[PDB]
């Protein structure tokens, strides 16, 4: 009745968000993916541009710092004597093979594709063309704009006056299973009342009751629950949690069967009255739980406290000894280990901190309470507060800040963030929706707005929301959000996402068919199971879900295979629809949850962004991984790369040195002195980044199989089964690795560089301790093995040592490296 009205009101606001995004505005409706950029502190590069009319592409050297706009008319100056009548605004640059367009107002160096090519030393192949020739099949139409949002596939009393006690009678649970009446004797509910993800009072337990007489489908309590709180004392974003328990029969402890969460105030600030039905899920099973709230002759509405139109100016009383203690906690890493006496102090001296905006999350966490009376003073500060850094504002979208005025203000500051930065943070933003109690929020409208204006964000949101549907508690919410995204995306995007969904469903079928057969059968099973994928590609041309810029037209069946390890992963080899492009090699794995692999890769990618933004390039391998369902997805295959194991055993056959397996492997593919030197250098930098990442994220499962090495010399992790396992040498540097770093059997200045890079990097991550703790905090509700409590964050905070300064931290990590060497540590200084 009110929930169907909330869905109706959501749709109407989404219908008027669509009005801001007409199909005519190419800016927000291009029809193509933008090649992603990560701003880098600014070097020459050779680029190979294909031009219409020319049979050979023009190859010239560009300044890395120079903008794509001038590189486009550098390429036009090569073909045309004078560009007075060529229409320079007509033209764009796209990556050869990949349906992604370079951003005209960004440096060539900024683009991820240019950064990657430079690292591998591969040829930068671009194509000069006009948006007329550029594929715009994903573009929204006039039909999509005019189309409505479907989303599917009298007397009032103000709350602050309401002295009535919060009470409700848990009536009954309906439709219990046959295996429930089998196992459990009696059932009881535990009722808890929370705000800012924290209990207001201890949870009240219901009486233990069996199934109702002559009705084994029904549990009837009909018990009145009374909390020791008035309606006036309830914050707006108050939530009632009901967990059902079942005591087992003598044929252990009581088992948690399911959870339910009711908002005491609805989306129009009216207190929940009369009978309300909530649905808890178990096994595909739908259990209806009835809660009867009081129903007086009047509706109780929440009204915010009258605004405090106050400006605190600028002359304030200054004490010098408090100034020291205040700026000490203002420049503290985070609000994590902040003690009670530190909070009361900051809260008292909060109005002195107005020239350090990024310390607001420390102030709001220091608040004594969120009582109705004490909200006026909080809103007064908030609405006169300077704008926060988007990455700082992330903390205000966590569980511990449920207030709508804080969250709505956090999202308003967030609008300052770029699409390219947001794109890599989307998983945390999707989880943050769980802390929005109302369907229609500032956060969901923000995400839908960016999804409309950027096809890479919309594409990423699709797969993240599709994974979030499997949440038993929040699957209902994400259903409505994904329906809003798909509806607003348009026919073009929808029809393409459907082709991607069918491909993964077919790749899923073959993947589990392959693992379910015998060794002799497997090769024949794959070749026959891939015929249904061969059929798919002859009626459809599909974009790779992992990287939707790549369009596959056909499968290279004879090149397709399996990796012959645990889970028997597939090696899907597709041919590019673009002849200018190259073969598409991806892995599809089934059985393993690839979300914790996704988080590890994300954290390593953010580390790389932080380093590159401070001018430190550790030449890191950043490969993609996407979860396309429950315990299945596809992983980017890094080309010309093997595990340290295979390299150590294959050159332990030929050599009895067991000191130069990695060295003689790199010399095989890098024979010239300068080629081996650049390969050894690539190793030093990539190894330093891996050692830092290994320690901070806590990955002790780094052995010869789990570490991989590219032929160019770049080291990178592949397995992330162990992650945040700080329950323990953290990383290991073998005699093989040391020999490559030194460039000899004795220590050189190249090891001092490796040590300098490690410590320098370690400190640049310590500077962003708050971001990492916030990004890992927001992924807690995802439900990943070893990221469940807030104590799991402390382990990462301890690794980052925010207490120490860069001097002491350098000494610590330098002793980590000396410990890492172990046996051969004696040789070094």
Ligand X SMILES: Nc1ncnc2c1ncn2[C@@H]1O[C@H](COP(=O)(O)OP(=O)(O)OP(=O)(O)O)[C@@H](O)[C@H]1O
Residues that bind Mg ion (CB under 5 A): 719
Kindly tell me which of 323 and 703 has the beta carbon lying closer to ligand X. Answer: 703
d(CA 724, CA 761): 19
* Residue 761 Cβ vs ligand X, minimum distance, rounded to whole Å: 22
CA-based nearest residue to 129, from 169, 94, 105 = 94
d(CA 182, CA 201): 35
Kindly tell me which of 565 and 826 has the beta carbon lying closer to ligand X. Answer: 565
Kindly tell me which of 18 and 710 has the beta carbon lying closer to ligand X. Answer: 710
The interface region with ligand X, picked from 32-40, 78-86, 200-208, 561-569 by CB under 6 A, is: 561-569
* Residue 559 Cβ vs ligand X, minimum distance, rounded to whole Å: 15
Tokens read off for 269: 């600030």
CA-based nearest residue to 611, from 785, 435, 768, 454 = 768
Q: Name the binder of 275 from Mg ion, ligand X, none, CB < 5-8 A by kind.
A: none
Kindly tell me which of 185 and 701 has the beta carbon lying closer to ligand X. Answer: 701
d(CA 667, CA 679): 9
Tokens read off for 783: 């439900």
- Answer yes or no: are the C-beta atoms of 272 and 255 closer than 8 Å: no
Examine residue 719 and tell whether it contacts ligand X (CB under 6 A).
yes
* Residue 682 Cβ vs ligand X, minimum distance, rounded to whole Å: 16
Q: Name the binder of 635 from ligand X, Mg ion, none, CB < 5-8 A by kind.
A: ligand X
* Residue 796 Cβ vs ligand X, minimum distance, rounded to whole Å: 23
Residue from the set 64, 567, 700, 753 that interacts with ligand X by CB under 6 A: 567
* Residue 715 Cβ vs ligand X, minimum distance, rounded to whole Å: 13
Examine residue 661 and tell whether it contacts ligand X (CB under 6 A).
no
Kindly tell me which of 272 and 711 has the beta carbon lying closer to ligand X. Answer: 711
- Which residues between 592 and 651 bind ligand X (CB under 6 A)? 623, 635-638, 641, 643
d(CA 703, CA 731): 9
Kindly tell me which of 74 and 706 has the beta carbon lying closer to Mg ion. Answer: 706
d(CA 423, CA 46): 29
Residue from the set 718, 729, 753, 825 that interacts with ligand X by CB under 6 A: 718
Kindly tell me which of 515 and 794 has the beta carbon lying closer to ligand X. Answer: 515
d(CA 304, CA 588): 52
The neighbouring-strand residues paired with 255 are 246
Q: Name the binder of 230 from ligand X, Mg ion, none, CB < 5-8 A by kind.
A: none
d(CA 392, CA 61): 40
Beta strands, E only, 272-327: 274-282, 285-293, 299-301
Kindly tell me which of 643 and 814 has the beta carbon lying closer to ligand X. Answer: 643
d(CA 648, CA 766): 34
The interface region with ligand X, picked from 227-235, 329-337, 563-571, 650-658 by CB under 6 A, is: 563-571
Q: Name the binder of 351 from Mg ion, ligand X, none, CB < 5-8 A by kind.
A: none
Residue from the set 614, 705, 806, 818 that interacts with ligand X by CB under 6 A: 705
Beta strands, E only, 106-264: 124-130, 156-158, 165-174, 184-195, 198-199, 204-205, 218-230, 239-248, 255-263
* Residue 594 Cβ vs Mg ion, minimum distance, rounded to whole Å: 9
Tokens read off for 1: 């009745």
Q: Name the binder of 669 from Mg ion, ligand X, none, CB < 5-8 A by kind.
A: none
The interface region with ligand X, picked from 434-442, 532-540, 564-572, 814-822 by CB under 6 A, is: 564-572
Examine residue 569 and tell whether it contacts ligand X (CB under 6 A).
yes
Cα-Cα-Cα-Cα dihedral sign, residues 171, 175, 176, 181:
positive
Kindly tell me which of 80 and 630 has the beta carbon lying closer to ligand X. Answer: 630
The interface region with ligand X, picked from 51-59, 111-119, 267-275, 562-570 by CB under 6 A, is: 562-570
Please classify residue 16 by burial: count the beta carbons closer than 10 Å to its beta carbon, then call 0-12 exposed, 13-18 middle and 19+ buried: exposed
* Residue 409 Cβ vs Mg ion, minimum distance, rounded to whole Å: 42
d(CA 492, CA 452): 13
> 442-453 and 404-414 are packed helices; what angle lies between their axes, rounded to 10 degrees?
20
How many residues sit close enough to ligand X to count as binding (CB under 6 A)? 16
d(CA 709, CA 486): 40
Query: Which residue intervals of 469-490 are DSSP H helices?
Result: 475-489
d(CA 453, CA 33): 11
* Residue 176 Cβ vs ligand X, minimum distance, rounded to whole Å: 40
Kindly tell me which of 364 and 587 has the beta carbon lying closer to ligand X. Answer: 587
| CA 397, chain centre distance (Å) | 14
Q: Name the binder of 565 from Mg ion, ligand X, none, CB < 5-8 A by kind.
A: ligand X
Residue from the set 183, 706, 711, 814 that interacts with ligand X by CB under 6 A: 706
Kindly tell me which of 552 and 625 has the beta carbon lying closer to Mg ion. Answer: 625
CA-based nearest residue to 544, from 507, 598, 591, 514 = 507
| CA 283, chain centre distance (Å) | 28
Tell me whether strands 551-555 and 570-576 are parallel, antiparallel or unpaired. Answer: antiparallel
Examine residue 565 and tell whether it contacts ligand X (CB under 6 A).
yes
Which residue's Cβ lies closest to ligand X? 566
* Residue 705 Cβ vs ligand X, minimum distance, rounded to whole Å: 5
Which residue's Cβ lies closest to Mg ion? 719
* Residue 626 Cβ vs ligand X, minimum distance, rounded to whole Å: 12
Tokens read off for 403: 């207030």
* Residue 464 Cβ vs ligand X, minimum distance, rounded to whole Å: 21
Kindly tell me which of 360 and 604 has the beta carbon lying closer to Mg ion. Answer: 604
* Residue 122 Cβ vs ligand X, minimum distance, rounded to whole Å: 16
Q: Name the binder of 812 from ligand X, Mg ion, none, CB < 5-8 A by kind.
A: none
The 10 Å Cβ neighbour count of residue 20 is 11
Kindly tell me which of 247 and 637 has the beta carbon lying closer to ligand X. Answer: 637
d(CA 802, CA 804): 6
Cα-Cα-Cα-Cα dihedral sign, residues 740, 742, 746, 751:
negative
* Residue 592 Cβ vs Mg ion, minimum distance, rounded to whole Å: 5
Q: Name the binder of 643 from Mg ion, ligand X, none, CB < 5-8 A by kind.
A: ligand X
Kindly tell me which of 587 and 618 has the beta carbon lying closer to ligand X. Answer: 587
d(CA 272, CA 700): 51
> 455-468 and 442-453 are packed helices; what angle lies between their axes, rounded to 10 degrees?
130
Residues contributing to the site for ligand X (CB under 6 A): 563, 565-567, 569, 623, 635-638, 641, 643, 705-706, 718-719
């Amino acid at each position: 009745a009110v929930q169907n009205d909330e869905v109706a009101a959501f749709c109407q606001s989404i219908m008027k968000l669509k009005t801001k995004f007409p199909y005519t505005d190419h800016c927000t409706n291009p029809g193509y993916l933008l090649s992603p950029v990560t701003v880098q502190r600014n070097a020459s590069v050779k680029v190979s541009i294909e031009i219409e009319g020319l049979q050979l592409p023009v190859t010239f050297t560009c300044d890395v710092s120079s903008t794509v706009e001038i590189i486009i008319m550098q390429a036009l100056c090569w073909v045309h004597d004078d560009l007075n009548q060529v229409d320079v605004g007509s033209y764009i640059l796209k990556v050869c093979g990949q349906e992604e367009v370079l951003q005209n107002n960004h440096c060539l160096g900024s683009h991820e594709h240019i950064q990657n090519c430079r690292k591998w030393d591969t040829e930068i192949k671009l194509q000069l063309l006009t948006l007329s020739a550029m594929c715009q099949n994903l573009a929204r139409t006039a039909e999509d704009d005019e189309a409505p949002v479907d989303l599917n596939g009298r007397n009032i009393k103000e709350a602050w006056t309401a002295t009535e006690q919060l009470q409700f009678t848990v009536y009954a649970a309906h439709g219990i299973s046959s295996n429930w009446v089998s196992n459990y004797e009696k059932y009881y509910l535990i009722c808890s009342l929370s705000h800012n993800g924290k209990d207001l009072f201890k949870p009240i337990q219901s009486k233990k009751v069996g199934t109702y007489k002559n009705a084994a489908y029904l549990i009837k309590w009909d018990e009145l629950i009374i909390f020791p709180i008035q309606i006036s004392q309830l914050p707006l974003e108050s939530v009632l949690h009901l967990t059902l328990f079942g005591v087992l029969n003598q044929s252990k402890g009581p088992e948690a069967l399911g959870k339910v969460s009711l908002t005491l105030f609805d989306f129009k600030r009216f207190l929940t009255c009369g009978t309300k039905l909530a649905y808890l899920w178990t096994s595909m099973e739908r259990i209806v739980l009835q809660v009867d709230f009081p129903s007086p002759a009047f509706d109780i509405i929440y009204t915010s406290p009258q605004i405090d139109r106050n400006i605190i100016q600028k002359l304030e009383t200054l004490e010098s000894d408090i100034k020291g203690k205040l700026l000490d906690i203002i420049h503290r890493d985070s609000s994590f280990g902040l003690s009670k006496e530190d909070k009361v102090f900051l809260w008292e001296n909060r109005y002195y901190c107005l020239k350090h905006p990024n310390c607001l999350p420390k102030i709001l966490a220091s608040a004594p309470n969120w009582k109705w009376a004490n909200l006026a003073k909080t809103y007064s500060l908030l609405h006169q507060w300077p704008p926060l850094c988007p990455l700082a504002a992330l903390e205000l979208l966590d569980a511990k800040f449920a207030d709508q005025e804080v969250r709505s203000l956090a999202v308003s500051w967030m609008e300052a963030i770029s699409d390219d930065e947001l794109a890599d943070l989307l998983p945390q933003f999707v989880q943050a929706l769980k802390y929005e109690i109302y369907l229609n929020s500032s956060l969901v409208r923000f995400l839908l707005s960016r999804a409309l204006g950027n096809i890479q964000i919309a594409h990423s949101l699709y797969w993240l929301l599709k994974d979030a549907l499997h949440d038993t508690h929040f699957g209902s919410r994400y259903e409505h959000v994904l329906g809003a995204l798909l509806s607003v995306g348009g026919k073009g995007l929808r029809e393409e996402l459907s082709k991607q969904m069918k491909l993964v469903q077919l790749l899923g079928g073959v993947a589990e068919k392959v693992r379910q057969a015998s060794g002799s059968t497997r090769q024949v099973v794959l070749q026959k199971s891939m015929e249904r994928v061969q059929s798919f590609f002859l009626r459809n041309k599909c974009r790779l879900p992992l990287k939707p810029s790549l369009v596959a037209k056909e499968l290279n069946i004879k090149s397709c295979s399996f990796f012959s390890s645990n889970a028997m992963p597939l090696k899907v080899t597709m041919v590019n629809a673009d002849p200018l492009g190259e073969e598409i090699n991806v892995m599809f794995k089934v059985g393993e949850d690839l979300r914790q692999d996704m988080l590890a890769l994300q954290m390593i990618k953010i580390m790389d962004k932080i380093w590159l933004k401070e001018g430190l390039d550790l030449r890191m391998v950043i490969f993609r991984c996407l979860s396309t369902g429950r315990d299945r997805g596809m992983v980017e295959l890094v080309p010309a790369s093997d595990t340290l194991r295979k390299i150590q055993v294959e050159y332990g056959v030929t050599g009895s040195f067991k000191d130069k397996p990695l060295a003689e492997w790199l010399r095989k593919y890098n024979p010239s002195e300068e080629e081996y030197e650049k390969a050894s250098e690539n190793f030093i930098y990539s190894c330093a980044g891996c050692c830092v990442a290994t320690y901070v994220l806590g990955i002790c499962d780094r052995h010869n199989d789990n570490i991989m090495l590219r032929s160019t010399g770049h080291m990178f992790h592949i397995d992330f089964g162990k992650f945040l396992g700080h329950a323990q040498a953290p990383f290991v540097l073998t005699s093989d690795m040391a020999y490559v770093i030194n460039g000899g059997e004795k220590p050189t200045i190249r090891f001092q560089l490796f040590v300098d890079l490690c410590c320098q990097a370690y400190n640049l991550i310590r500077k962003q301790t708050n971001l990492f703790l916030n990004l890992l905090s927001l992924m807690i509700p995802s439900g990943l093995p070893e990221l469940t409590s807030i104590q799991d964050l402390k382990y990462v905070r301890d690794a980052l040592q925010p207490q120490t300064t860069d001097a002491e931290a350098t000494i610590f990590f330098t002793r980590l490296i000396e410990s890492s060497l172990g046996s051969i540590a004696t040789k070094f200084n």
